[PDB]
Amino acid sequence: PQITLWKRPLVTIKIGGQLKEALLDTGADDTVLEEMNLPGRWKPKMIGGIGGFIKVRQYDQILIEICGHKAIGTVLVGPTPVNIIGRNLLTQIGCTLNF
Amino acid sequence: PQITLWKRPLVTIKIGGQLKEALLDTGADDTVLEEMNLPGRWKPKMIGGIGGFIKVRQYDQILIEICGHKAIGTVLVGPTPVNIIGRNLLTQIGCTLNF
Numbered sequence: 001p002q003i004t005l006w007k008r009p010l011v012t013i014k015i016g017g018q019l020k021e022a023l024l025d026t027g028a029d030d031t032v033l034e035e036m037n038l039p040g041r042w043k044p045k046m047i048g049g050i051g052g053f054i055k056v057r058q059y060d061q062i063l064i065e066i067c068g069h070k071a072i073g074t075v076l077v078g079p080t081p082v083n084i085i086g087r088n089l090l091t092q093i094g095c096t097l098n099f
Numbered sequence: 100p101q102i103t104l105w106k107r108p109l110v111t112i113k114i115g116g117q118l119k120e121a122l123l124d125t126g127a128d129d130t131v132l133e134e135m136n137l138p139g140r141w142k143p144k145m146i147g148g149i150g151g152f153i154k155v156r157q158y159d160q161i162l163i164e165i166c167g168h169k170a171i172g173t174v175l176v177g178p179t180p181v182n183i184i185g186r187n188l189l190t191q192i193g194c195t196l197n198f
């Protein structure tokens with residue numbers, strides 16, 4: 001669909017069988033979700049934001065459905081203030097900016 | 100135009116008579132610009148993201164030209180690592196997400 005920006009671009013995602021709400025975030029290189037149990041191996045990583053760095057768990061090749069669109073890619077899990085969908089997955093669902 | 104998300108959505112903006120590069124960021128409520136000595140009154144603010152909070156100076160009714168599209172609104176100035184155009188200005192230039 002076409003999503004305006006008068007409100008936060010929040011959508012329902014499905015990951016690990018669980019439904020959650022996430023922010024479509026064109027300023028995020030990567031997808032970062034709040035703490036949750038995800039099956040499969042993971043490796044620790046660091047990511048930096050406006051306020052500094054945090055420690056995250058990196059899950060590769062994770063299936064995630066975003067507003068009805070399937071993606072399979074990297075999902076970071078950690079103390080992010082909000083679930084964010086970043087460009088690594090926004091590209092997979094065909095998302096562009098338009099004005 | 101239409102901006103794909105393979106790369107960071109960086110565009111040229113014009114503010115305070117200066118040209119800069121800034122990220123079109125749907126995940127940012129408001130616009131945050133790198134340290135600059137803008138004239139006029141301001142109010143202190145703290146904004147949070149990944150890593151915690153930073154202190155910024157909130158200027159109101161600032162004109163910014165973004166890819167030839169004019170917008171006027173609140174601009175936060177502080178030690179951000181990147182110039183960030185947030186939804187408060189993205190709405191004014193007709194920017195939408197589309198997939």
Ligand SMILES: CCOP(=O)(COc1ccc(C[C@H](NC(=O)O[C@H]2CO[C@H]3OCC[C@H]32)[C@H](O)CN(CC(CC)CC)S(=O)(=O)c2ccc(CO)cc2)cc1)OCC
Pocket residue numbers: 023025026027028029030031032047048049050051052053080081082084086124126127128129130131146147148149180181183185
């Ligand atoms: C670049 C060199 O410095 P750097 O490496 C990273 O620099 C940055 C690059 C992009 C951003 C933009 C930021 N993206 C981000 O956090 O993405 C993470 C995950 O994906 C990675 O890619 C980029 C960073 C990594 C997000 O889009 C917008 N944020 C809000 C969301 C936070 C989850 C929602 C709460 S907000 O900025 O905090 C913000 C809060 C309030 C207001 C006023 O309303 C305006 C803006 C910030 C820093 O860090 C130095 C150690």
